[PDB]
Every structure is written in C-alpha cells, then in structure tokens.
Amino acid sequence: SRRRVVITGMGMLSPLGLDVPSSWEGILAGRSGIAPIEHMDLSAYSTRFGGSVKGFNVEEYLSAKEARKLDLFIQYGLAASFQAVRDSGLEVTDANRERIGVSMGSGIGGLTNIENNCRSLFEQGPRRISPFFVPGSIINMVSGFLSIHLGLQGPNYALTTAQTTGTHSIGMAARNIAYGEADVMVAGGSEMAACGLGLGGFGAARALSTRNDEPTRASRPWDRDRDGFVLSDGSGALVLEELEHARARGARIYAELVGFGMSGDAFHMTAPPEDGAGAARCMKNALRDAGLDPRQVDYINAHGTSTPAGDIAEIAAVKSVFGEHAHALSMSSTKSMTGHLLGAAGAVEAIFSVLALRDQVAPPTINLDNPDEGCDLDLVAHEAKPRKIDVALSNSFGFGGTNGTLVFRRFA
C-alpha cells in the first residue's frame, strides 16, 4: 500500500546562483538574474536577454574530457543532481543501488548541440558530425549519465512535457516510491534553450518579452505592462525518499511531498484557457491526492510566466479552487526574478516551495508595479513576506495543455 515521500536533498543551477543557498538568498532579496546574453550575437533577434547561469564550472563535477561530449542541459542536470545527492547524505551501496533511480527531464534538451552539429552538417558535411551527437544531446542522458557516475540501478527515465517537465518529473518519481518501485529517486529537470533556434523559435511565436533596454524589469507576472516570458537556463534536482527509509538512516527531512496532480486542458496547443479550467482540475486532483481541505494551502509558487493569457488564467484557477480562501493564501512567481527555466521551471520552483516551508517566508513577485484587471490576490508584490506556511503548492502549465501541481507540507 501507498508509502509516504520526503525531500532529503536539493540541488540547483539558476540565473541567481550556482547552488540552492546562493539562489535562495537572491530570491529572498528580490534580485533579478536577467541580463543581456553574452554567449552569442543576438543583434538580428527581437529578444537579446535571458536568465544565464553565470560562472558555471563543470570541472567542479566532471572531467573536461567528459564535459566536452555533453550539451550544457546535461552538464546543468548532472551538477544539480550531484548537489542533491551530496546534500542528502545518502551512501549508494550494493544493498540499495537497485532501489535508487533517477527521473531528470528537459523540455527541449540538447538544442545548442543539435544546432552546432546541424551547422557542421550543412557547411562541411556529415563526416564532421560529433560521434557523441546522440548520447550528448538526447533528453534521457541526464538520467543515464547520473546512473553511470553514481551506480544507480533503479528506475531510469526522463519526462519531456515542455514547461511542466520539472513538476511531472518530481511527481511521477514520488509515485515510483509511493508504490514500492523504488525507495529513493533523484528527480527534477534541466534546460539550456538559449541558442539561435531557441531564442529564434520563441521569438518567431512572439512568446518572449522584447524589453531589451531593461531586462531586469521584463519578467513582471500579473503586471498590466507584461509582454511575454523571459527565457532562462539551469537545473533543479531533489532527492525523494520513502519516509521510513529516511527515518531509518537519520536523514535530515526538508518537507513531505503529500500531493501530485496532472490534468490535460484539451484546449489549445500553446494557449491556456482564460478561465484556468485545466489548472483548476489539476490543483483539485493534487489537493484530493494530499487529503487536504483547500483552506490548508498557505503558499502557492505560481507558474506565473509573465504572459498576458497565462498569468490571468492562474488567478481565475486559484479563485475557482480556493474561493474566499484565495484572499488568505500568498501566491508569488519567482519567475519575476529567475525567468522561465522551461523544463527546469517546476524543479527550481519545487525547491523554492520547500524553502518557503523551511524558512516560513513567501518569496516576492518583483516588478508587480500595477497589478492587471482581476489580479487582486496577495501576490507578495516587491518584497518577501514572512508568514505561517504549513502547506505549499507549486504549479506548472505547458504546451499541449499539460498541467502539474505538487503539494508539500512541513514534516515534524
């Protein structure tokens, strides 16, 4: 029968820092990680800024010889995974290696690498494609390379559900443990889509903020002057562990994962329905899964992408799920500061949701100068809000009408 699941380890690369503590300090201080992009020439692009990981040293984790073969999204996924496993204190042994698995996902995966090999192919010929093109680019190789480096022989897989990837990855990994398929899972996501095709492709869809002259103010969830999401890079990883397994080894437990919801909108390939019907169905699934009264929800880490339709849909969904209690909880978008890490969004935001529980503070939605029509909830505008948080919820919505909700609570 269904086992309980706790968080014993966390790891992160974000536009705010090269680990969890440094990222979280930036979150609580309302600091933006968004800046003009330096790694390529974007003069022909309508968007020239994003959330870059600054000063990442892969040789903190891997040999330069191995790193050369891997896309940045794999390098970032391994770094966050390595941090989370170390943070857990867990020792991998012959006695437990078959019971530890990994589910690290990505929305787009190795687009930089595929673009660079596509350039080699077109300009030179197929004989210049890297021998490592496939294993260095395809999305399942975070899970693959992590298992090879740590000796994890448990369930080994990868989700790809666009902007919902990190949330689904964590939820489904919790279900693996819940149902006895594993005792430990390393789960989350990673993304590095800041190449020509990434910035160009989201640009062609007119999905991105074009506030090139003020990048720190571009990401402005629920602000009436928002004009699209900000593209950001990085990784989140959590060590999920069966409760009795955690208790037995004396693990430090950050929080319990009590609820997971998924729902499809079945509405539109790219647009969320204005009323948030799919997001509402997903949160209600997650709250029922957790055995909660919705009035127990203290904090919501919103998807909050800073799109016109997405941000208002989320207000509508929260009002419909929580009714009068919608006015008592706090809801913030850390994407105000980090931008949109796409497949990694749900992973870093799950970490921010757990840290909201550890520290009893709602992170701010920075840049919320003029809340839009109907955006009249506690959106923690401008400044972190210390407050009682027993139950935190983290939402993600994605292309294909794909929704995920995670429910965390304090563990005593």
Added chain:
Amino acid sequence: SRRRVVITGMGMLSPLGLDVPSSWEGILAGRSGIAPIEHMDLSAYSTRFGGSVKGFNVEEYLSAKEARKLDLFIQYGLAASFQAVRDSGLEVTDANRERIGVSMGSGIGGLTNIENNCRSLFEQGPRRISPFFVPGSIINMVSGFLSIHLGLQGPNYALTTAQTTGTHSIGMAARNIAYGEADVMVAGGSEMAACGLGLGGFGAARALSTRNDEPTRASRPWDRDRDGFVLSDGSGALVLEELEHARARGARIYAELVGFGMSGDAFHMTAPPEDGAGAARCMKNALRDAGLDPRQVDYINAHGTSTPAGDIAEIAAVKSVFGEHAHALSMSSTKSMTGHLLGAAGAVEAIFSVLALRDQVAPPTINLDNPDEGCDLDLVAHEAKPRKIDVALSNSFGFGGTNGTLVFRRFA
C-alpha cells in the same frame, strides 16, 4: 491492491505497412521493410538505407494546415494514436474524459523540423524560423495534440528514454490505470530520425550497418556478420484500459498487460554490459511484477538491434533469467524486418507481442544465416513458428543503460 490492465486498441505506422494488420502480415511473411532512403542526398553518408514509412497520407488524420505545423514524428504518433482509439471502439464523453489520458513518447523528437529551421536560420537569419517551430517539434505534442483533438483530460505526459521510450510509455501508462489515476491511456511512441542528423549522428558513432549493397540483409540480429542497427521510422499506439471498464462496454480485448519492469545498467552511455546484467534485473523485475515464474514465459520479442555487443548481452541475460527454460521459450527480433524505430521500437514490438498471443505464432528473426558464438537459443531463424504462447515478454535496452520489459498474457 491493484487493478488489471488490458489492451483494447492498437495502431501503427511501420516500414512494413500503414496499419497493424498490413505490418503484421509482413512480419509473419518474413518481409523486410528496409530500402535505400529516397528524396534525400545521402552521397557523403556511410549508410544510405533504412526503414521509411511508405505512402503515409497525413490528410486521412489532419487538415493540410494542421499537418504543416507538426514534425513527421508527431504526424506518425497521431496516426498510430487515432488508429488505436478507433480500433478500441471507445466513446469519449463528459462522464469519462477526465479518466482518459495519453503518454506517447519519442527518443529523438523533431530532427527533420530542427534541420529545416537550421537551414532558414543559417541562410537567412532567425526571422525565417517558423512560428510553430517549438510546439511543432517538442516531444509532448503527440500527447498534446491527441488530448486536444479527442478532448482527453486524464494524465497528459510524454517519456523520452531513447530506444526504451515505447516500452516505458506503455508500462507507466499501465501503472496509471492499475493505481487508479486513469481508466484509459493511449500509450506508445513515434520516431522519424531519417534526416542528415539521425543518419549522420549514428553514422559518426559507427553504430549503423553500412551494408548498402544489400539493405534487406543489413539487420541480422545474432548473425556473426551483423555490423550495427538499421534506422527506421514509424509509430505504435495501444489503448490500455482497466478490465472492468473494458468488460462493461463489451470491448474486444487482445491481451492483458500483467508485468512491467524497469532497471538501469549504470554501466556505459551507449554499450550494455557483456553479461546483460541490467536486462536480466529488468526481466526479473517484470516477472516479479506479474507474479510469474520465469518458466511460464513462452515468447520474447527481443530488443535484438543487430549490434555486436547488444545482441550477445540479451542472450546472456535470457540464459541468466530463464536457466533450464532458456531454450524452451522462443525469442525473435522483429527488427530483422522493421529495423530499429528507436523510441517507437518498444511500441510496435508490444503490438507484435500481443499479436503473437492472438495468433499463437512466434515472428521470425530473418537473416539469421550463421548464429554467433553462444547464440544457440530458439531465435526462430528465417520463418515464423506456430507454437503455444500464454506469456510474451517485450524487451527494450537503450542509451544511458535504460531498460524496459513488458509482460503480456492471453486473456479469456
């Protein structure tokens, strides 16, 4: 306790045919779907052949306008999925749509789209990138488009575990139903990596057969003259359904899905361990999941890719798991005929495993002229073998050392 899961609908595009019955007819006749790749300059490539889908008409499924928005791998996934849902007779209603979900995956995703948008980007700059580039290329859009078209509001996700994708998708969809998160799931995979990038990428790793003079003899699993896998395109979709749900509406039930196993090799990025230790753990996990003794297995659809190390690892794993029963079962690689559909391999091979149960026949391993050292199992060389089959396994072993096994049983 756990709900029972049955197969009530199947759909396919393969190198043998544009549906299940035409593909299966080719399989039992020992026909090859492999041929030189057309309408593509492969002059500078060491491999010039593969398994193409021949005569696919997307306008049987989509308007020209919707099909223009979608990579071939998505078109193929949608074709298989629509076929599977039609084949099932299922009526989607307001009363059941929240209980019907989708998990259609891909190993490599939108390489053909990425290739064509790279052309535009390099030649003319980013403003010629298609608006639909991102939603038209990301792996979760088969699940996304299918859910939107049919109004499916159940779990909506996509796996990407390289050559294991189709097996994991079906297995994890079966878990969703067994543990009551859904009553119906459309599950499987789709793949179209016959671009410069797939042929070039696998070619750079010298992973492909280069037998250009005799494409139909290239894929020769367990034959001493094999020289790597054959790249193939297509899709498989299954309608998975809770047993009481299927019986209440009078569904035609092909077979029961009794067992699902996962494991990680934790060994190498592209090569399996010589003894197939990971594949052995995975099959043992799948049989434990089914409550079955290795002795009860009659038929194995092998991964059987025609790689030197892969084929020999699978013989070792089967001998290890099945002891004195290893010769009694029949094991064949339908990849001898279809080539390797990568992420769709597990989906089309689950369908072939189900049909081996319906028709009491083991598909052939064609081209097995000279079994290699230790390849002395019943590999159904050359010709289909009518025989008793109560229990059929389907194995997938992919990059990152990610393993999947499905156990199907006759239903009466």
